[PDB]
Amino acid sequence: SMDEECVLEAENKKLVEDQEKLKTELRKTSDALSKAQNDVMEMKMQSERLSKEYDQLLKEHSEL
């Protein structure tokens, strides 16, 4: 009936609105996860580089 349809329509508008909010939130959370995963990666290869230069410093002083 026309009334049932108008209820379904109203419900569908609300669900689409909620889906937009949910997608937005998923998108932010997901970006944040990505950035954090890069930061952990960038700090590791940074840290490795640093340790190599550390050991090298020790050597510069162990071999004169």
Q: Which CB, 61 or 63, lies closer to a second copy? A: 61
* Binders of a second copy in range 16-35 (CB under 8 A): 16, 18-19, 22-23, 25-26, 29-30, 32-33
Find the DSSP H helices in 1-64. Answer: 2-60
Alpha-carbon Rg of the chain, whole angstroms?
28
Enter the tokens of residue 16.
């689409």
Separation between Cα atoms, residue 37 and residue 25, nearest integer Å: 18
Binding interface with a second copy (CB under 8 A) = 4-5, 8-9, 11-12, 15-16, 18-19, 22-23, 25-26, 29-30, 32-33, 36-37, 39-40, 43-44, 46-47, 50-51, 53-54, 57-58, 61
